[PDB]
Design a protein around this ligand. Sequence first.
Ligand SMILES: CN(C)S(=O)(=O)N1CC(c2nc(N)ncc2-c2ccc(F)cc2)C1
Ligand SMILES: [Cl-]
Length: 350
Amino acid sequence: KVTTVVATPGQGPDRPQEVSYTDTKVIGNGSFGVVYQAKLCDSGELVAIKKVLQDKRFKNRELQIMRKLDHCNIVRLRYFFYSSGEKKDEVYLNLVLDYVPETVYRVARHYSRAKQTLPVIYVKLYMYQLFRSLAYIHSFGICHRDIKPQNLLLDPDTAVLKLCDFGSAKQLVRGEPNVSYICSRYYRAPELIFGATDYTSSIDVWSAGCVLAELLLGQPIFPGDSGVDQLVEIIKVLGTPTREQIREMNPNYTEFKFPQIKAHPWTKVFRPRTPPEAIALCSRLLEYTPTARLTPLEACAHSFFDELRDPNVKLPNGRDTPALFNFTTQELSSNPPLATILIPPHARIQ
Ligand SMILES: CN(C)S(=O)(=O)N1CC(c2nc(N)ncc2-c2ccc(F)cc2)C1
Ligand SMILES: [Cl-]
């Protein structure tokens, strides 16, 4: 059995191609709709097809965003096409994406179940690549707004990480308000919990920090079934936020005061032999004041990632580390001077 569609390439000019695929499995299910796996007939390559209801009213924002993006650490939209079948008279948008086998979520949980933590080298590789993907999208003023381990795809052999699921992503424009019900629990920045609608891209940075801490800890750092419970956990670590910090997150001073707890020394939060650089980075990501958090690009240049810039660094399995230094001017525009740290001497050899 073989499906053949006429699809538009995600990048490049509108030059429709006849695409045929087979072995259609299922995955995903949820909010958006369905995700299938498939095998492209000629090349034999695996792809994921995300199928969602097309609005008719507006054009699909995820698609609009996907087509603008091209980066080694973001899933490639290979094709998109429309279809339906069945008793519906409703259009479905189908996004054909590179299939990447693992996710940070699944990996983390394997190590967690086995009472292990992921080797710090993998923590470095995954986090660096995430920050690059954020640096890139943020440069277009696009915030992901749902950074979490399930959205971080991994090829285990190459150590390559790819940000996915742009269903929540949106261009944040100074002055325009945005819904505060967007991020997934545990990874929500305080300003989101306080219902702020004037938030910036630094919510993604907070979320990234939550992922780092979690890979280090072996479990979510700020858990809770309610916002109340999450804030308690946040306060247990960061300490009680000052009236200044409180005004910084949500201007609209919700209505209350929290228990007055002092800052738990970040060193006492983590397993005893945790690298100090890792801990330092966390504290500079997980800050109350949104403007006080490192930028993605600033994070990449943090000393916690120095090992990745070492010329002799290899994967434990012997392979080379994947591309880490092929920055574009687009990607560096945040702060071009950082190139002198980000691009190590050996990467400039001729
Ligand atoms: C594409 N996203 C909307 S998603 O539904 O969250 N998507 C993450 C999952 C995904 N997407 C892509 N592109 N490749 C492999 C996988 C994947 C599916 C199942 C897995 F166990 C691991 C990875 C499915
Ligand atoms: Cl044509």
